[PDB]
């Protein structure tokens, strides 16, 4: 016989959240950052040696 009105008995109770999300997401990417970049204008490149 609950003689009180704690939130557990409440209905339509707007709970509270935290304004952030946690994601580990390993994103080392050493190779992509270690080889630089070179822009071209063709889908097929080649060298000579």
């Amino acid at each position: 016989n609950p003689t009180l009105f704690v939130s557990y008995d409440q209905n339509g109770k707007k709970l509270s959240f935290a304004n952030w999300i946690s994601v580990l997401s390993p994103q080392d990417t050493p190779f992509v950052s270690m080889t630089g970049k070179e822009s071209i204008n063709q889908t097929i490149f080649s060298w000579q040696t």
């Binding site: 630089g36 070179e38 063709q42 490149f45 060298w47 040696t49």
Partner: protein
């Protein structure tokens, strides 16, 4: 070295559809100066 042709660009396909599509495009390739410069080594055990 990393050869790139189409840089990362946020875009969308054709339209006149009933959906909210999105899409990106990164067109990239791999280049190597001389095969005998770098090296690879495989690990395994003999049978």
């Amino acid at each position: 070295t990393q050869m790139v042709l189409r840089a990362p660009k946020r875009t969308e396909l054709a339209k006149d559809g009933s959906y909210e599509k999105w899409m990106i495009e990164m067109e990239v390739g791999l280049r190597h100066r001389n095969p005998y410069a770098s090296g690879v080594l495989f690990t395994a055990a003999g049978k």
